[PDB]
Amino acid sequence: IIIATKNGKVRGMNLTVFGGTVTAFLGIPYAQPPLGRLRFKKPQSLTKWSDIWNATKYANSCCQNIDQSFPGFHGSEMWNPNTDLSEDCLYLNVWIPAPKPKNATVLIWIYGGGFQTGTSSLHVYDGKFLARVERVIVVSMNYRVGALGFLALPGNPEAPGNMGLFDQQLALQWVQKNIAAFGGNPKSVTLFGESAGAASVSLHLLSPGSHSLFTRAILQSGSFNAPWAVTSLYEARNRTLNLAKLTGCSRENETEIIKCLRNKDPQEILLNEAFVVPYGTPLSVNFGPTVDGDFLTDMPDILLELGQFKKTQILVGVNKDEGTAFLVYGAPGFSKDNNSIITRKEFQEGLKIFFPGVSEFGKESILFHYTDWVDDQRPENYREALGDVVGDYNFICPALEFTKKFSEWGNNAFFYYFEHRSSKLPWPEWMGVMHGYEIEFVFGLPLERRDNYTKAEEILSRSIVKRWANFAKYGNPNETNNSTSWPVFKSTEQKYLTLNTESTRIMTKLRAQQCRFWTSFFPKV
Amino acid sequence: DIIIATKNGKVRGMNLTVFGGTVTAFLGIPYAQPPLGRLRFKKPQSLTKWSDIWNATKYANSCCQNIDQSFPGFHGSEMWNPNTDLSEDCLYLNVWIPAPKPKNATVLIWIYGGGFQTGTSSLHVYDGKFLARVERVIVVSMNYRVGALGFLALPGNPEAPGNMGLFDQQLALQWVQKNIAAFGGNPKSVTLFGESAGAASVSLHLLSPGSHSLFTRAILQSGSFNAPWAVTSLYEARNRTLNLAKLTGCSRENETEIIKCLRNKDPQEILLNEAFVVPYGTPLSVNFGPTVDGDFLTDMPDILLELGQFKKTQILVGVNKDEGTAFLVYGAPGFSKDNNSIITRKEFQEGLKIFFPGVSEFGKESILFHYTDWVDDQRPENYREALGDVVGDYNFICPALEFTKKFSEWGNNAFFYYFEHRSSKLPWPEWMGVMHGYEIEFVFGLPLERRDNYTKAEEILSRSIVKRWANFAKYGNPNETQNNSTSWPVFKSTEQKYLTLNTESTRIMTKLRAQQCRFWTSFFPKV
Numbered sequence A: 001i002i003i004a005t006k007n008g009k010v011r012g013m014n015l016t017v018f019g020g021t022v023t024a025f026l027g028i029p030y031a032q033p034p035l036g037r038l039r040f041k042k043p044q045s046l047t048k049w050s051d052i053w054n055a056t057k058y059a060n061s062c063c064q065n066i067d068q069s070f071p072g073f074h075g076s077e078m079w080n081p082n083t084d085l086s087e088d089c090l091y092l093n094v095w096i097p098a099p100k101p102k103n104a105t106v107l108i109w110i111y112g113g114g115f116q117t118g119t120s121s122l123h124v125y126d127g128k129f130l131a132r133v134e135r136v137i138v139v140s141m142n143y144r145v146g147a148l149g150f151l152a153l154p155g156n157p158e159a160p161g162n163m164g165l166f167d168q169q170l171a172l173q174w175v176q177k178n179i180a181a182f183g184g185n186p187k188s189v190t191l192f193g194e195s196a197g198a199a200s201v202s203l204h205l206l207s208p209g210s211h212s213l214f215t216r217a218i219l220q221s222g223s224f225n226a227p228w229a230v231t232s233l234y235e236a237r238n239r240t241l242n243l244a245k246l247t248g249c250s251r252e253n254e255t256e257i258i259k260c261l262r263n264k265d266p267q268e269i270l271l272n273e274a275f276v277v278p279y280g281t282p283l284s285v286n287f288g289p290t291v292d293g294d295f296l297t298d299m300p301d302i303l304l305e306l307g308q309f310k311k312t313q314i315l316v317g318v319n320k321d322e323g324t325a326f327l328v329y330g331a332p333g334f335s336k337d338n339n340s341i342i343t344r345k346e347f348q349e350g351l352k353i354f355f356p357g358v359s360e361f362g363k364e365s366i367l368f369h370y371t372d373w374v375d376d377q378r379p380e381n382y383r384e385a386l387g388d389v390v391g392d393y394n395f396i397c398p399a400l401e402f403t404k405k406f407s408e409w410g411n412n413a414f415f416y417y418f419e420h421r422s423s424k425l426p427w428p429e430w431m432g433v434m435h436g437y438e439i440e441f442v443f444g445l446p447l448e449r450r451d452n453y454t455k456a457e458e459i460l461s462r463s464i465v466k467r468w469a470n471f472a473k474y475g476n477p478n479e480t481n482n483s484t485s486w487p488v489f490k491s492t493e494q495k496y497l498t499l500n501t502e503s504t505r506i507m508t509k510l511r512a513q514q515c516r517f518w519t520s521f522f523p524k525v
Numbered sequence B: 001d002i003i004i005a006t007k008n009g010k011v012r013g014m015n016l017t018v019f020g021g022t023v024t025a026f027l028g029i030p031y032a033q034p035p036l037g038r039l040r041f042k043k044p045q046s047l048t049k050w051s052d053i054w055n056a057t058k059y060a061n062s063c064c065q066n067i068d069q070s071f072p073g074f075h076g077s078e079m080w081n082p083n084t085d086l087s088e089d090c091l092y093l094n095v096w097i098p099a100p101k102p103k104n105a106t107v108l109i110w111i112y113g114g115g116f117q118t119g120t121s122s123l124h125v126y127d128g129k130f131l132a133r134v135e136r137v138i139v140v141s142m143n144y145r146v147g148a149l150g151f152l153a154l155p156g157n158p159e160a161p162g163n164m165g166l167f168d169q170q171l172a173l174q175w176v177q178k179n180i181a182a183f184g185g186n187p188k189s190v191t192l193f194g195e196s197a198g199a200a201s202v203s204l205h206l207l208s209p210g211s212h213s214l215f216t217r218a219i220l221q222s223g224s225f226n227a228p229w230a231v232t233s234l235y236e237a238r239n240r241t242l243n244l245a246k247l248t249g250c251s252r253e254n255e256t257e258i259i260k261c262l263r264n265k266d267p268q269e270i271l272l273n274e275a276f277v278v279p280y281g282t283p284l285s286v287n288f289g290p291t292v293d294g295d296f297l298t299d300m301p302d303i304l305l306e307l308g309q310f311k312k313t314q315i316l317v318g319v320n321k322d323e324g325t326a327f328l329v330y331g332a333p334g335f336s337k338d339n340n341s342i343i344t345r346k347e348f349q350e351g352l353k354i355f356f357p358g359v360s361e362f363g364k365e366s367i368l369f370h371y372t373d374w375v376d377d378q379r380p381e382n383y384r385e386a387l388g389d390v391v392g393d394y395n396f397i398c399p400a401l402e403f404t405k406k407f408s409e410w411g412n413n414a415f416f417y418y419f420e421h422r423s424s425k426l427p428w429p430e431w432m433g434v435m436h437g438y439e440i441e442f443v444f445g446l447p448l449e450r451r452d453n454y455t456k457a458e459e460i461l462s463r464s465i466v467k468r469w470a471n472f473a474k475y476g477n478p479n480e481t482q483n484n485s486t487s488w489p490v491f492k493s494t495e496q497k498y499l500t501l502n503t504e505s506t507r508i509m510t511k512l513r514a515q516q517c518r519f520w521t522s523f524f525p526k527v
């Protein structure tokens, strides 16, 4: 079937999903290909095509380095791109219930990947189950990553920074001018994302240019106040100049540096992004969002303190073991192929890798705060402490803090704590409930019963799916009789809802004792 | 009928059956006027036009060269000898195209080695049909003049200017530019690859401005221009020209009468005297090779490299594990191919005299000292392997590593490999190991042919190297697949990472033989 968009018509596909049908448009272009003289610039709006575009296959994924630490391993390769890499990559995808709705709420997914990786066409981001089961329209877009998306020379329209954020913004504009032709409501659109996708979503809360382009926001395992999320203009200029040296592109002038960089083979940009930082860590974001004076008119924390942001409802959460995924990408003694029992010395060496610039006194204080063992017998105490150090500092504690400050402006906020470990998880049991492994429950993958999930995992996925869709439609993540009511998160009581197969409780002040260190003592070492 | 219209006339080819498919082969296409008579020792003259159909259906003549007859009937030495007739009329190229015809194929151009004194593009180990068949690339190779007929030099004299063999290669590259679209090839996707003096040739095309528009990317197997054997100083070349004139009764008062005299000599009278132009030579002597001619090379190549004056593109470089052992059975005391060549410390010292004729007694002692820190004192094999490694490190491995460092410092992606697999069909004894030149049959896919008695592990290894080489040419990155494959990382002068190639495990490693090479880069030049 065909739909006419404001720049031409596109042809879709019929998908048979759970005894019904979902109509899919995969690979709609939404911007001019950022090639040649457009490399490093903001995305240019598309002009009309006379033929009919066939949105029938997923499009090219944006240029990016590939995780090849574990050749053959599903737990790492499931995140790698599954279409061809190319600078020609500004495409989005649209999934629509059948029969065609007339004012369906739209959910727009922004993937993560540390701003360096990612693509909207991963299996775990398949929006067909969401459209089928809750009658929402699901949209996802490819946006530029690494230096091709976030190389910054502040002030210069040739390489201004945040280009990948503007990609996302141009996709949200596309939805405003086209989703009605598909049966969707441009006045009921909810952004959701994970990790850098979540951080991206929260930056759309701040940027005035994005204010009118969506309604509500969902932030899975990420926010802009996380330590990895924003590069200083200082650091970004140091890194741009380092990439210039590593590629042979050091000039005396900004515009000649980018003229030279625009002539490099993409793989000569890609394969040098790793060296622009002298002391990276497994959480390094070589090229990420900056204070560009355009997307971010100021520095996000001031915008958040002063209350200069879109006022709306938010849904925010974290997983139980955010930290463990990064331990096997650098920390000594850790492996996916053994139980990774480490000593206090190895723990001290892992703190070095994750906190390279921290004084010996500060690293001792991290150690001390995380070693008040409730059972000082357990060999795996140190292995768990290091994962909790990384997870609390990089994900959990910033998410709580963001929700506190955002709520204190008269906004309904809801917070969740995801504790279910997937029965299919390819990684070892010690990594627990990992970063990224709630996504397949949010997208409804366990509802497919020919897939080796458990029954409880189907029941859990179905409620998360329902609650997310309800928050999109109504602004409150409610479910149907025998269902826990989700209370608002408020600064004083700090109530959050737990998610797991056993019992979903309501709790207060998540990990408050851990996070007191990262907010109130660590900033002073 | 199989007919392509080239800018000099029409050519007719032949169909080949490879792995249940077809490869169109044009063998023996001329690319230059035959360098006969008054054209002896001059740069190649561009071709005119013929009206017939040229039949490009057999390999052409090999250029004149002495043959290696050290081991009559020995496949090991004789597989390198020319397999077509010898003649001064030898400037022909071959083209292998995948069937069905491609529309914009990437082109790989092979430049053979052979000490700049031997070699031919028609050898069985250089057969491009497998690569065309399996990776859908066009494969071109050319014959270029070797020995004094290719590299005799009186610098600045157009009658014998130097580097003619290199201009031959260049003229063939110009042919690919002008003509290869007609065959289905993309002139804008051209990768040069070559081995030994073919690899030193490839690296010189990166330095030579006249070559810069004739290719895209470069692959260097077991050689580069900074190797000690690869380039003669301008006046050492001019001196050898006059010794050859003297050895043939062509000494004259002016250079052009010398050349006029040499031009009337029989090719064999010239070949017969090429060995004698060097006072003392090693098994790695290049009597007549590249020199600084003021045309193809406008300075000593080490200067141009250091100053960043070379083509900025991606390179793939590597070496074999036992580069040196081949040269020990060609002059060193105690070494035979027919016994296990256990030698003594005194035989080792005589070995060094053979390969380092002009080095002081202290210099030869320091080389010995650096290479005798045994892990096990006996190990009867210690001194035998030390000598092979001395020869291998100084002539191939350490210069390839140094060229890759320096080249990569100017901002392009480089990729280094260490080839460690001994061919199961290698006719040479086991003590010689992974020899010089014995990765070539794996680069061209000869193990993919199952009727040929390779192991199946060698088919998987050759299949992988073929894929990485072709992907490098197409994409500038020698990747195999995205999943289930060791990533080949860029070679950077800090970490200096390389990929090992063998049947057991391809590993990412660092600082290949740095403890050895530090001697040759930082102590031996002070000796």
Ligand SMILES: *[C@@H]1O[C@H](CO[C@@H]2O[C@@H](C)[C@@H](O)[C@@H](O)[C@@H]2O)[C@@H](O[C@@H]2O[C@H](CO)[C@@H](O)[C@H](O)[C@H]2NC(C)=O)[C@H](O)[C@H]1NC(C)=O
Binding pocket: B052, B053, B054, B055
């Ligand atoms: C190149 O070869 C042809 C002969 O080719 C044969 O015929 C071709 C048409 C084709 O079928 C090939 O596969 C065959 O091998 C030479 O031929 C001239 O014309 C006819 C062709 O059959 C032949 O009977 C004549 O005798 C040939 N002319 C002469 C003067 O002998 C052609 O000359 C060859 N080209 C060169 C440069 O030698």
Ligand SMILES: *[C@@H]1O[C@H](CO[C@H]2O[C@@H](C)[C@@H](O)[C@@H](O)[C@@H]2O)[C@@H](O[C@@H]2O[C@H](CO)[C@@H](O)[C@H](O)[C@H]2NC(C)=O)[C@H](O)[C@H]1NC(C)=O
Binding pocket: A071, A072, B464, B484, B485, B486, B487, B506
């Ligand atoms: C995945 O591919 C491997 C190939 O092994 C490798 O290739 C190397 C060059 C390097 O890239 C390395 O990282 C990569 O793993 C297949 O391998 C092997 O399987 C054969 C049988 O088919 C055995 O004979 C080998 O011993 C075995 N080698 C190993 C495991 O190292 C493997 O079958 C394939 N698996 C899947 C699921 O695709």
Ligand SMILES: *[C@H]1O[C@H](COC2O[C@@H](C)[C@@H](O)[C@@H](O)[C@@H]2O)[C@@H](O[C@@H]2O[C@H](CO)[C@@H](O)[C@H](O)[C@H]2NC(C)=O)[C@H](O)[C@H]1NC(C)=O
Binding pocket: B235, B239, B240, B243, B244, B246, B247, B276, B277, B278, B279
């Ligand atoms: C250039 O090379 C000369 C080499 O001369 C030789 O005579 C040739 C015919 C040839 O057979 C070769 O084997 C001979 O070495 C250098 O001249 C040298 O000095 C003497 C002069 O005839 C000669 O007897 C020596 O044998 C030779 N030197 C050595 C070490 O063998 C000449 O010095 C070189 N340099 C220049 C600038 O000409």
Ligand SMILES: CN(C[C@@H]1CCCN(Cc2ccccc2)C1)S(=O)(=O)c1ccc2ccccc2c1
Binding pocket: A067, A075, A076, A079, A113, A114, A115, A116, A117, A195, A196, A228, A282, A283, A284, A285, A325, A326, A329, A434, A435, A436
């Ligand atoms: C280069 N990075 C590679 C990462 C290393 C660890 C994560 N894996 C993915 C992964 C594996 C297993 C389970 C879940 C996820 C790959 S990254 O570009 O992907 C990256 C960088 C910094 C980030 C900082 C904050 C959050 C995410 C980041 C991701």
Ligand SMILES: CN(C[C@@H]1CCCN(Cc2ccccc2)C1)S(=O)(=O)c1ccc2ccccc2c1
Binding pocket: B068, B076, B077, B080, B113, B114, B115, B116, B117, B118, B196, B197, B229, B283, B284, B285, B286, B326, B327, B330, B435, B436, B437
């Ligand atoms: C006069 N040379 C004859 C050689 C001597 C040793 C090599 N064999 C060939 C051979 C045998 C076995 C395995 C591989 C190769 C014959 S040469 O002109 O061919 C020559 C000269 C100098 C070179 C310097 C660098 C590399 C190769 C050289 C070849």
Ligand SMILES: *[C@@H]1O[C@H](CO)[C@@H](O[C@@H]2O[C@H](CO)[C@@H](O)[C@H](O)[C@H]2NC(C)=O)[C@H](O)[C@H]1NC(C)=O
Binding pocket: A235, A238, A242, A278
């Ligand atoms: C900015 O970039 C420069 C360029 O690399 C970095 O410089 C190095 O700093 C380390 C100390 O960590 C020294 O060991 C090196 O010798 C320095 N190299 C050069 C060329 O100066 C610098 O650290 C970077 N700074 C920041 C804050 O990013």
Ligand SMILES: *[C@@H]1O[C@H](CO)[C@@H](O[C@@H]2O[C@H](CO)[C@@H](O)[C@H](O)[C@H]2NC(C)=O)[C@H](O)[C@H]1NC(C)=O
Binding pocket: A063, A084, A085, A086, A087, A266, A267, B471, B475, B476, B477, B479, B480, B481, B482
């Ligand atoms: C090997 O890696 C290269 C990346 O360097 C891949 O290249 C892309 O390849 C596709 C062809 O399938 C092209 O359409 C894209 O335009 C290429 N883009 C870039 C930036 O190179 C290549 O596909 C990989 N091949 C394999 C077999 O994995």
Ligand SMILES: *[C@@H]1O[C@H](CO)[C@@H](O[C@H]2O[C@H](CO)[C@@H](O)[C@H](O)[C@H]2NC(C)=O)[C@H](O)[C@H]1NC(C)=O
Binding pocket: B103, B104, B186, B188, B189
């Ligand atoms: C074969 O591929 C080349 C690119 O490698 C095509 O050339 C295009 O890109 C060139 C970049 O070097 C530019 O010059 C042009 O944009 C374009 N060239 C043209 C239109 O002639 C080339 O056309 C391809 N030929 C085919 C597909 O037949």
Ligand SMILES: *[C@@H]1O[C@H](CO[C@@H]2O[C@@H](C)[C@@H](O)[C@@H](O)[C@@H]2O)[C@@H](O)[C@H](O)[C@H]1NC(C)=O
Binding pocket: A424, A451, A452
């Ligand atoms: C679900 O499981 C099916 C059967 O297989 C497996 O479990 C173990 C024993 C291994 O053999 C493993 O390879 C299999 O997963 C699979 O055929 C099917 O593909 C699986 N589907 C998913 C989505 O995992």
Ligand SMILES: *C1O[C@H](CO)[C@@H](O)[C@H](O)[C@H]1NC(C)=O
Binding pocket: A470, A474, A476, A478, A479, A480, A481
């Ligand atoms: C939740 O959805 C909307 C928004 O509050 C409301 O109309 C509906 O009755 C609610 N249902 C439940 C079960 O809370």
Ligand SMILES: *[C@@H]1O[C@H](CO)[C@@H](O)[C@H](O)[C@H]1NC(C)=O
Binding pocket: A001, A014, A021, A098
């Ligand atoms: C699936 O296919 C057709 C193709 O035109 C599409 O129009 C429709 O949504 C589906 N067909 C039905 C429902 O009969």
Ligand SMILES: *[C@@H]1O[C@H](CO)[C@@H](O)[C@H](O)[C@H]1NC(C)=O
Binding pocket: A011, A051, A052, A053, A054
């Ligand atoms: C568009 O899609 C239709 C679907 O069958 C296909 O037949 C047609 O060839 C396609 N054409 C273009 C230009 O995409």
Ligand SMILES: *[C@@H]1O[C@H](CO)[C@@H](O)[C@H](O)[C@H]1NC(C)=O
Binding pocket: A102, A103, A185, A187, A188
């Ligand atoms: C929903 O869609 C209808 C479609 O006509 C529109 O009139 C209405 O304003 C939209 N807004 C809301 C809040 O439902």
Ligand SMILES: *[C@@H]1O[C@H](CO)[C@@H](O)[C@H](O)[C@H]1NC(C)=O
Binding pocket: A253, A254, A255, A256
């Ligand atoms: C930057 O340098 C180049 C070098 O010639 C020059 O042409 C250009 O005008 C310069 N631009 C500015 C803004 O200085």
Ligand SMILES: *[C@@H]1O[C@H](CO)[C@@H](O)[C@H](O)[C@H]1NC(C)=O
Binding pocket: A333, A334, A335, A337, A338, A339, A340, A341
């Ligand atoms: C786990 O594996 C890593 C890497 O193989 C190793 O360094 C570490 O010591 C191992 N630990 C245990 C407890 O086996």
Ligand SMILES: *[C@@H]1O[C@H](CO)[C@@H](O)[C@H](O)[C@H]1NC(C)=O
Binding pocket: B001, B002, B015, B022, B099
């Ligand atoms: C050449 O190959 C083509 C394609 O396979 C084939 O149709 C034709 O018969 C062949 N011509 C010959 C062998 O003369």
